[PDB]
Structure to design on (1302 residues):
């Protein structure tokens, strides 16, 4: 069952990003805090939509896609990925990682249903690395 | 109005991009016409130093995020 | 059946050659226009007799003979010429190309009867190349610079014209055109070509790149 | 049997391109007019040689090659191309499209003999699209 | 009259060749006698600078067109 | 002192590069820290025309020699 | 056994580079002189450290690396390189060429021990080509004319120098040199080359012909 | 074992050629001096590359080739050439004289290995005669 | 004296050749030294028009008779 | 047995050539007269030495050699030459035509001994054609 993040925490994090900036160690610590439980693509996408401005959000979408593509290359380079399965029918496509696959587009409940925990942690680590890249790039 | 937005002589590029994307997405354009307009406004606004920086791009930039990344990489630190 | 070219078109072309000259691109375009259908040796000979003066006509006869001789050398070097046949009895002699063979001298009808379409197109291409040679001869690439106000397509046209209509070998035109694009073409375009993330190895590619990334002004 | 285009029409079209330019709607209409019947590679090649300057002609050769390559990719992606046949022996190579194949180099009569009507219309549409690209690029 | 044609002191060579070929071809000579006459008139008319230029031709020129081409190549630009 | 070296308004770039490389290599830095320092001093010193010239480099320059070559190629002849 | 180059010769060469510059033919001759015996990476590296300033030395390190990489690509493209061996265990890595391999870093004696003579000559030729590149870079062929008073061998030397030390491909230098001999080289020599009963198809042949038939003055 | 010529002697000879010219008797004496021991094609080629300018070097390459061709004609006219052998398998090709044969291109050590002393002296005499021709031709 | 013979400004070439060959063959030179001397006197005497005519000979002339034939062919008729 | 031509006739012919020139029809008639009987190479050589000046004599030697070479080419193109024989041992070399062969150099008696009548008439016709060429060339 999907539970959304508190809008109070999200508002506090957005104001933190607004006053301290993207690169302060306190901001990265707060992001790591709100990045503790494995989030669904819907959660991370809406979170970055709210806390980041338009141009940093575009940059972050780009960087997140690139990092997820590196993850999928490593996944096709190793059939023992915690997102993959043993047979070929469990291979994870980027539509399933970005939340674009069938039964997931716009629906967080179905998303949480079909996604694997390894998928969730890989998406989360990818999003964190992308946030770091964009923060280092913006300023 | 999005079509009246210019990058000021002293303004940074991320502020200009923020203002432009805000005014373009919060306007009466269809959703499928925002990215091309944002790109073509990056190219024609954004005072001639960045205009020439985008013009002489050895790669083809086909997304506002890619243009922003390229300009932030190769911008004149000042 | 042979049909002559209109004397009205020929008169207009002659006046074009008289006012614009032999080398203008409009004149070459008009010649290409009147060189559209494959002409018989009689047609091309009379056409050059009318549009060209006496001395350019002598030069053109010389050049046409030389080009036809090159064609006949290539023909004896390949029995599959569209003017040739499979057996040795269809080999095409220069008397048949210049219209001097038996049953053709002075008679355009018999000419059109015995000639092949491959013969006609070879004669026509030879005459066009000879006209180009004589035009380049009747009236320097390393002195061409892009003017401060000149556009880039005009400069490229002028440079390619002067390089291809010169004494260089055919295998040395592309490198020279590239290296002249790089060193001429005033320093804005010079730096635009220098900072090319890709390697441009053809004049067409350089032209496309410069036209894409040029400073609109 | 091959019939050449009138040099009078070609001269008028060349002067139209000379005065109005490459991109005027009247020029594109005139080109569409002279692009009505399916032309052989020889015809289109000589036409572009006469009406276009040297540099636009180089650009047009490039663009025509690229568009013909896209056509040949679509042709190998569908064995029911009006240029293709049913068996593998009728597959159309770029040497046959550009007029470079055996029995065609420099000879328009043989060209018209071996070429298919689907081949002719594909070559013609490719040349028209290439002309549009070069016209949009030159100015 | 073809046999009275001289290249003037200030006249160019292409004008002289045009005038001479015109007067020789529009005359009473047989068709098979025009080329040798045109050549021998190029050699003896065409004031002594071009006369010596044609005389000292390392190759043998056997056609009016070839003589015209050679002279146009090696002529004294003035 | 290397961190006090600026390219003068009238100084050429090869003289500035010579002076900077001299002062950086003849200093107390470790050997593995000279190239990054020389690069980052080329980028932040070397008055804003060359700063923008290095910033808008379509390629990534990862060596002082490559930066010197690029700047010498695309420098404003004056 | 490794023997160092004389510091007297190195001091004289450094002062030569200081007064004459990097591109003078006397400087290149002196470098060729001190580049006679195959040098170890240590020798060439210290030599360029001493004779070149800091910025030319950085440029030269870059160019030397690039040329050595081209050499190693040719070496992996041919197992019969005089630096390579027959088996795969003798393949030469760039650490062994630049002197960075094990047992060589900072030690010229061990360097001379493990290196091959083919390795040494390849390193030396690479360093010479890199020096030429940097010299051409530190300080235009289509602007070269033969002066009214200049001899022809000086003009040919200057032209061949500027054409070979330029951005042209290697396969485009001879045609360009020929066509520049024909269009430059003031009209007396122009007519001398034009009226050549033989066809001259090489810069050396043109130079020989012109030197034979030139107007002694 | 191959030993290179001293760059000091080569520098002195280059300056001699630079000040006195190509045709002075002192210059020819110096060349004869540095032409004392039989040189490998590599040595003579680099020597002429250093002491001669570009255009005299082209002329000298031409003349050296012509003289070597005359030598090879005399060699095929007499099987008792000090460069030849008794059987047909020792016949000396121009690739072996100019240093272009297999195992010699760019490698002076292998060159010195496979070359004969008669080959070396013939190459040396040919190079000396070519130098004389070019010197008589240049001025 | 053979070494004092020059071709006069108005003298024809066959007269000059006759005079020179006469004076060279009726002199104190060895028989094996007459042809080279006659050739080298044709080249250095024989006023600069014929000098340049002999200099620009696409073929190599190695006999006085061949030089005489060539000059008589390509001489400036006047 | 060899009989020399009268020095009186030769003196009269020399004065004819001196006053009338080389190309007058009377001079050619006189030469044809003194060219009536087949002459030995010695006779024609001395005749041209006496009647012609030095430069015309050089030209005539050249032209005579060229014409004799054409004759020898025709002779090797037809084994039925009146100078040739049936076997290969009678083939006529240019040393035998120019009088340079063994037993002929400087000796007119031996010349007349070994020469054939066909050889004599061929030499004579060659000399006459060479005289015509030189006469047409001199003026």
């Amino acid at each position: 069952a999907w539970t959304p993040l508190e809008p109070k925490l999200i508002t506090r994090l957005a104001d933190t990003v607004r006053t301290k900036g993207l690169r302060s160690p306190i901001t990265m610590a707060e992001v790591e805090a709100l990045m503790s439980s494995p989030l669904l693509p819907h959660d991370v996408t809406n979170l970055m939509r709210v806390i980041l401005g338009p141009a940093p959000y575009a940059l972050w979408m780009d960087a997140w896609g690139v990092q997820l593509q590196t993850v999928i290359a490593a996944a096709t380079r190793d059939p023992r990925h915690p997102a993959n399965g043993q047979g070929r029918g469990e291979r994870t496509n980027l539509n399933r990682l970005k939340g674009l696959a069938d039964g997931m587009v716009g629906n967080p409940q179905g998303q949480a249903a079909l996604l694997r925990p390894g998928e969730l942690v890989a998406i989360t680590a990818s999003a964190l690395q992308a946030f770091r890249e964009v923060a280092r790039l913006a300023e």
Summary: The helical segments of chain A are 7-20, 25-34, 41-51, 54-76, 94-97, 108-114, 117-138. Residues 54-76 of chain A form the longest helix (23 residues). Residues 1-138 of chain A form a domain with the Human Immunodeficiency Virus Type 1 Capsid Protein fold (CATH 1.10.375.10).
